[PDB]
Amino acid sequence: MDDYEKLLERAIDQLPPEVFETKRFEVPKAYSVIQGNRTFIQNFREVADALNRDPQHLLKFLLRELGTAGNLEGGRAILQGKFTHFLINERIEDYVNKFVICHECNRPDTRIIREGRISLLKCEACGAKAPLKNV
């Protein structure tokens, strides 16, 4: 149930949200490669989703840390800056591997909150989680 996922491709790509279902975007291996001073992204599609469901954000982040030119090299997505599988792997591993890291946040007997469509939340109980703003 982890590796050999049961992806039916039901409205998880071009198929409009006509069919009701839960979109489980999680697949092993989701990190870039450190090459001198550039990141050779190969799964920009999968790596991007997990690292950030929204492509607009993920992209704004690579440039925000990319101190170099910043562009797509090769044929996949070899950017250049500071996105050396740093923030990428961290965020992705947070969601894809939220079970072993979040300690199976099933029915926590605490006050949990999630905002941004499974993007942000708090887990002061089973560790710590980022809600959104600091009041």
User: What is the total count of residues that contact Zn ion (CB under 5 A)?
Assistant: 4
- Where does this chain touch Zn ion (CB under 5 A) — which range of 8-16, 36-44, 50-58, 101-109? 101-109
Residue 105 within binding range of Zn ion, rule CB under 5 A: yes
Pairwise CA distance, residues 74 & 29, whole Å: 20
Beta carbons of 123 and 129 less than 8 angstroms apart: yes
Residue 59 within binding range of Zn ion, rule CB under 5 A: no
Q: 59 or 126: whose CB is closer to Zn ion?
A: 126
Pairwise CA distance, residues 110 & 120, whole Å: 16
Residue 102 CB, shortest distance to Zn ion, in Å, is 4
- Where does this chain touch Zn ion (CB under 5 A) — which range of 23-31, 37-45, 53-61, 115-123? 115-123
Specify the amino acid at residue 42: Q
How would you write 32-99 as a 3-class SS string?
Answer: CCEECCEEEECCHHHHHHHHCCCHHHHHHHHHHHCCCCCCCECCCEEEECCCCCCHHHHHHHHHHCHH
Residue 49 CB, shortest distance to Zn ion, in Å, is 21
Collapse the DSSP code of 132 into the 3-class scheme (helix H, G, I; strand E, B; otherwise coil) and give the result.
Answer: coil
- Where does this chain touch Zn ion (CB under 5 A) — which range of 42-50, 56-64, 87-95, 119-127? 119-127
Draw the binding track, 18-47, toward Zn ion (x: CB under 5 A; -: no contact). Answer: ------------------------------
Between helix 44-51 and helix 87-96 the angle, nearest 10°, is 70
- For binding to Zn ion (CB under 5 A), which residues are involved? 102, 105, 123, 126
